[PDB]
Amino acid sequence: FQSMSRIALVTRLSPEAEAHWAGHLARALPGERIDGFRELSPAERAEVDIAIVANPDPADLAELPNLVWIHSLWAGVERLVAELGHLARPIVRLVDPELARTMAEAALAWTYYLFRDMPAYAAQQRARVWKGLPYKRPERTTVGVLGLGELGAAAALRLRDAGFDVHGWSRSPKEIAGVTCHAGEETLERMLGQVEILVCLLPLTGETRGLLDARRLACLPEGAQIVNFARGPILDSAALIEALDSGRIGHAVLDVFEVEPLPEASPFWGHPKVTVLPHISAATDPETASAIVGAHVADYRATGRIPPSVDLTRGY
Amino acid sequence: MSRIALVTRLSPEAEAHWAGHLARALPGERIDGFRELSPAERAEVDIAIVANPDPADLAELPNLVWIHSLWAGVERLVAELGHLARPIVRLVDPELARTMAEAALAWTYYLFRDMPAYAAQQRARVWKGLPYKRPERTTVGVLGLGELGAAAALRLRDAGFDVHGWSRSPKEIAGVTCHAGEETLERMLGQVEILVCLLPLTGETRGLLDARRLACLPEGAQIVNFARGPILDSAALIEALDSGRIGHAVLDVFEVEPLPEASPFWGHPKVTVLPHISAATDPETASAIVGAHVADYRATGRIPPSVDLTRGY
Numbered sequence: 001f002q003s004m005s006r007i008a009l010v011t012r013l014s015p016e017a018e019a020h021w022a023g024h025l026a027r028a029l030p031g032e033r034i035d036g037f038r039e040l041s042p043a044e045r046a047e048v049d050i051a052i053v054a055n056p057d058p059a060d061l062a063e064l065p066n067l068v069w070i071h072s073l074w075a076g077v078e079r080l081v082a083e084l085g086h087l088a089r090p091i092v093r094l095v096d097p098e099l100a101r102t103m104a105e106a107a108l109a110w111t112y113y114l115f116r117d118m119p120a121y122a123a124q125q126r127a128r129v130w131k132g133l134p135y136k137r138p139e140r141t142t143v144g145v146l147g148l149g150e151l152g153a154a155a156a157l158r159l160r161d162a163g164f165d166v167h168g169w170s171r172s173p174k175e176i177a178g179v180t181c182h183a184g185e186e187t188l189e190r191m192l193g194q195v196e197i198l199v200c201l202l203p204l205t206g207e208t209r210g211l212l213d214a215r216r217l218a219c220l221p222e223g224a225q226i227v228n229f230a231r232g233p234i235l236d237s238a239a240l241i242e243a244l245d246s247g248r249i250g251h252a253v254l255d256v257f258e259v260e261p262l263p264e265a266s267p268f269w270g271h272p273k274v275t276v277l278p279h280i281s282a283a284t285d286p287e288t289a290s291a292i293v294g295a296h297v298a299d300y301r302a303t304g305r306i307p308p309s310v311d312l313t314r315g316y
Numbered sequence: 317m318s319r320i321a322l323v324t325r326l327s328p329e330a331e332a333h334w335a336g337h338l339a340r341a342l343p344g345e346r347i348d349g350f351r352e353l354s355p356a357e358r359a360e361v362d363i364a365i366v367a368n369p370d371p372a373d374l375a376e377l378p379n380l381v382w383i384h385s386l387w388a389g390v391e392r393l394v395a396e397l398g399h400l401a402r403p404i405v406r407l408v409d410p411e412l413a414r415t416m417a418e419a420a421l422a423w424t425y426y427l428f429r430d431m432p433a434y435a436a437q438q439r440a441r442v443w444k445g446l447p448y449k450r451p452e453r454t455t456v457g458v459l460g461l462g463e464l465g466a467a468a469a470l471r472l473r474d475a476g477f478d479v480h481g482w483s484r485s486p487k488e489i490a491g492v493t494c495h496a497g498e499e500t501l502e503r504m505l506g507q508v509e510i511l512v513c514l515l516p517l518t519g520e521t522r523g524l525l526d527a528r529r530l531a532c533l534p535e536g537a538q539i540v541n542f543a544r545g546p547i548l549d550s551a552a553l554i555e556a557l558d559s560g561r562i563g564h565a566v567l568d569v570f571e572v573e574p575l576p577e578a579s580p581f582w583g584h585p586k587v588t589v590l591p592h593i594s595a596a597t598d599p600e601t602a603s604a605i606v607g608a609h610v611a612d613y614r615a616t617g618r619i620p621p622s623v624d625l626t627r628g629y
């Protein structure tokens with residue numbers, strides 16, 4: 001008798017949302033024994049080699065003594081790094097072509113919202129004002145993308161194909177057809193000097209927290225507009241409000257915030273130059289994500305291969 | 317006291333390696349990394365030696381005269397630096413031609429000698445010999461008959477393959493069937509069992525190998541892309557691999573490099589991913605070529621032949 005391995009589903013989602021996930025995972029991984037952490041006895045916990053996680057309680061993972069690796073269901077991993085790094089087990093984030101497709105679409109959709117003056121036209125409508133605003137071509141309009149990763153590079157390609165003059169920024173050098181790529185801290189402020197619409201798709205780390213502070217925001221040309229699809233703490237909220245109120249930044253589309261759901265007292269809900277979205281730019285698709293987890297687990301069972309994991313020292 | 321700026325986004329170790337080779341080939345010249353020059357020293361630069369430079373750095377060399385790339389491919393230089401109107405000199409090097417012609421034959425053999433099928437059998441613990449047919453019975457097509465493409469067609473010819481080549485204007489290559497013009501591409505592709513791409517990326521070659529052109533290849537044809545990623549429609553390629561119409565693809569070049577982790581190419585059973593290594597620039601030979609060009613400029617004022625921006629390659 002040699003106990004076979006099992007999988008713990010470890011989340012702090014609602015019971016309904018966790019059940020939805022369970023069904024999708026069970027269908028994608030039909031040969032596997034997958035159970036909610038709370039359903040396992042102490043002896044069953046010792047049989048777990050893989051945890052599938054969604055905002056897991058880190059104390060639960062510490063009670064899986066033979067855990068080998070961890071699969072998250074989200075692209076962002078800053079809290080996993082902070083809370084689970086000490087267990088020294090590989091953390092596999094979600095990398096999914098469908099997530100990339102969806103985010104790249106979002107990036108273009110909300111770049112268009114800003115570019116085509118949709119907020120100004122909405123304000124005019126409320127005022128019963130009929131007034132056409134001047135148009136300038138995308139080829140004359142510089143769009144900057146911060147982050148050229150699974151999501152950021154995909155976004156730069158959609159924005160390129162829409163005809164924008166696209167500049168991208170990342171930590172290490174990239175080559176992206178039809179996109180001007182910049183790398184390193186040393187080139188950021190120069191890049192920003194040129195950017196009329198700025199899209200943020202960075203991960204949150206010690207190095208990106210507060211990147212878009214008063215100084216960096218002041219690098220943007222007058223009337224520049226910003227889209228934050230990354231994490232709230234990358235963009236200094238106080239500095240953003242000052243820049244909006246001084247007329248130096250024209251508008252901000254914010255999908256991510258320090259506290260979610262955004263508290264009712266936030267000035268962002270009522271600011272005339274802010275568009276609030278409830279963290280929906282690129283929602284995980286449970287079908288495609290489950291099939292990816294499924295393939296990763298199958299490959300592990302077949303060959304011992306653990307998928308690419310987060311470098312803790314890098315932080316993403 | 318003119319000086320030379322070395323402008324790259326290579327690693328510090330690779331750029332230092334290059335700097336040593338250039339310093340040896342150009343002993344009388346003051347060559348420094350762009351990041352080491354003060355604003356005043358930047359004003360003394362008349363020549364930039366470049367390898368994936370940030371274009372904004374070149375825009376800060378106000379008395380720049382001309383630019384020498386260390387790479388054969390120039391499409392980003394054209395797009396990003398064309399506006400400065402300084403001559404762009406691409407790398408043409410017999411050793412680069414030799415290396416790429418070698419790569420073309422090496423990876424043609426990888427396909428021809430069934431190396432992927434044998435690797436799949438090995439993973440399955442299956443012992444099974446596959447039928448062999450002579451190279452003289454296998455048609456190989458080369459897209460691009462330039463510095464690299466013609467050299468590749470000659471190596472393939474000499475290995476005994478039945479070689480067809482395609483370019484914009486007519487060529488005569490002994491022992492090779494040469495086709496020219498858009499009008500002859502689809503007819504050529506109809507005959508090709510292994511297709512090697514050695515075109516430059518331009519407005520005219522982007523998306524050349526789309527669903528329609530890929531459908532011209534005979535069933536089971538195999539492809540080698542050593543040109544640029546955008547020349548080959550990725551979605552169309554995957555559909556052709558999955559339908560069984562294309563047998564295998566060796567891909568060295570992609571629209572985004574490094575290839576994103578989400579790319580279907582990494583995991584596809586009928587795809588071999590190479591990290592843009594088919595023909596790396598040889599720092600010794602390329603340095604001696606840059607050296608001779610700079611020396612001739614210092615001696616006579618001659619700027620070497622440069623890229624025609626309207627032509628795009």
Ligand SMILES: NC(=O)c1ccc[n+]([C@@H]2O[C@H](COP(=O)([O-])OP(=O)(O)OC[C@H]3O[C@@H](n4cnc5c(N)ncnc54)[C@H](OP(=O)(O)O)[C@@H]3O)[C@@H](O)[C@H]2O)c1
Nearest residue numbers: 075076147148149150151170171172203207229230281282
């Ligand atoms: N709002 C939503 O609905 C939503 C949904 C999903 C994800 N997200 C967010 O999107 C982020 C990106 O996801 P992803 O999968 O694209 O991540 P990823 O593949 O790791 O890419 C991250 C990119 O950011 C760059 N970067 C990181 N630190 C940097 C620094 N200090 N300086 C300059 N560039 C730096 C990286 O540079 P290198 O390439 O050189 O490593 C890389 O290009 C997530 O972390 C998450 O916060 C939001």
Ligand SMILES: NC(=O)c1ccc[n+]([C@@H]2O[C@H](COP(=O)([O-])OP(=O)(O)OC[C@H]3O[C@@H](n4cnc5c(N)ncnc54)[C@H](OP(=O)(O)O)[C@@H]3O)[C@@H](O)[C@H]2O)c1
Nearest residue numbers: 388389460461462463464483484485515516520542594595
């Ligand atoms: N993967 C790697 O490591 C690597 C390394 C080096 C180079 N490369 C790639 O290899 C490419 C070729 O280099 P090269 O030195 O051979 O260039 P080249 O000497 O300029 O030759 C280019 C060839 O392509 C043909 N061509 C260009 N546009 C065409 C079109 N629209 N239709 C048909 N034929 C067309 C040219 O026709 P004509 O003869 O009529 O002018 C010529 O035969 C580079 O641009 C680079 O992208 C890749």
